[PDB]
Amino acid sequence: RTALSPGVLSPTRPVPNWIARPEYVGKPAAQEGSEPWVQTPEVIEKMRVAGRIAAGALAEAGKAVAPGVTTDELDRIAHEYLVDNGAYPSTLGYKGFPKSCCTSLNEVICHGIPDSTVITDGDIVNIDVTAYIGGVHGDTNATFPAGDVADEHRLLVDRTREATMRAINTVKPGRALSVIGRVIESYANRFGYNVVRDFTGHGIGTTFHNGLVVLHYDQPAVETIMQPGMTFTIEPMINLGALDYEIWDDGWTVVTKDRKWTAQFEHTLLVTDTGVEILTCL
């Protein structure tokens, strides 16, 4: 189709009052960035719940991706899943973000705002859902095809899923955190793709972005070694075209400047005593 432009947002969706809000709702910023990177066993138990719920909501929204649906509808479906399972949608009110997930079509790198945009045949759409429950967060995203997607776009989506999975498989106690982005970027560059730098994965736990940064490109200056009980996301955004990007007037939606398409996948991971566990499985 043509380059995307913003549509119209629906009103704020209410959350039942008994579901606890993260502290950052309504505030300019969150109290995050200095929390421990290794979680207690009690928080890891709570994060398995949050991760399962976020994974259910992402799958339920994903089922609705089809030509003719709006991105606003994918948000209604994710929102209703979260609140029916007693979770707060962590994006809603983080730095004023106005919706309960991010929906990023085609050339949107990330942080697309669900709205009246209608998906058509051949689009790809990333849906990114985070659940807050039990005082902890779980964060996952995936790119879904709508209709008959062109080969070059189907391959970019399947290879971005593959790069994410190959990076997950490196996680274990003692591994250098920098191996994640060496594996992702070495694999993506086999095909001529370019791995986004300015947006990264992150530690997550009782806070959304806890100060730990997970890079998806090769950066051996990072000295961090993975520890049992560390929790973080791997969420590479991979571009067909160049890395240059622009931000829309809403101050959220990030688009490639050349309008070439881009895909992303994300899980929340636990470093176990021997390897890795995906917490955002249902």
Ligand X SMILES: CO[C@@H](C(=O)NC1Cc2ccccc2C1)[C@H](O)[C@@H](O)[C@H](O)/C=C/C(C)(C)C
Q: Does 235 bind ligand X (CB under 6 A)?
A: yes
Number of H helices, E strands in the chain: 4, 15
Q: Which residues ranging from 99 to 118 are in contact with ligand X (CB under 6 A)? A: 102, 110-111
Cα gap 67→146, rounded to integer Å: 6
216 annotated among ligand-binding-site residues: no
Q: How far is the CB of 170 from ligand X (least distance, A)?
A: 19
Q: Does 91 bind ligand X (CB under 6 A)?
A: yes
Q: Which is nearer to ligand X, 7 or 122 (CB)?
A: 7
Beta carbons within 10 angstroms of residue 150's beta carbon: 12
Q: Which helix (H) or strand (E) holds 131?
A: strand 124-133
- The residues of the shown chain that bind Mn ion, judged by CB under 5 A, are 128, 139, 141, 233, 266
Q: Which is nearer to Mn ion, 46 or 111 (CB)?
A: 111
Question: Site for ligand X (CB under 6 A): how many residues?
Answer: 16
Q: Does 94 bind ligand X (CB under 6 A)?
A: yes
74-101 core/surface letters (b: 16 or more CB in 10 A; e: else):
bbbbbbebbbebebbbbbbbbeebbbbb
Amino acid letter, 138: G
235 annotated among ligand-binding-site residues: yes
Residue 59, both tokens: 């799958």
Q: Does 128 bind ligand X (CB under 6 A)?
A: yes
Q: Which is nearer to Mn ion, 153 or 209 (CB)?
A: 209
Amino acid letter, 144: F
CA angle 250, 254, 255 (to 5 degrees): 115
Q: Which is nearer to Mn ion, 181 or 220 (CB)?
A: 181
153 annotated among ligand-binding-site residues: no
Which residues pair with residue 102 across a beta bridge? 128
209 annotated among ligand-binding-site residues: yes
Options 79, 202, 216, 267; binder of ligand X; rule CB under 6 A: 202
* Binding pattern for the stretch 181-200 against ligand X, x by CB under 6 A and - elsewhere: ------------------xx
Cα gap 282→270, rounded to integer Å: 15
Q: In the 8-state DSSP scheme, what is residue 38?
A: B
Q: CA distances (Å), 254 to each of 81, 106, 198, in order? A: 26, 11, 11
Q: Which residues ranging from 27 to 46 are in contact with ligand X (CB under 6 A)? A: none
Options 81, 97, 217, 265; binder of ligand X; rule CB under 6 A: 97
Among Mn ion, ligand X, none, what does residue 97 contact (CB within 5–8 Å per kind)? Answer: ligand X
Cα gap 190→274, rounded to integer Å: 30
Cα gap 21→33, rounded to integer Å: 19
Q: Does 130 bind ligand X (CB under 6 A)?
A: yes
Q: Which helix (H) or strand (E) holds 185?
A: helix 178-189
123 annotated among ligand-binding-site residues: no
Residues that bind ligand X (CB under 6 A): 91, 94, 97, 102, 110-111, 128, 130, 139, 199-200, 202, 209, 213, 235, 266
Binding-site entries for substrate: 111, 209
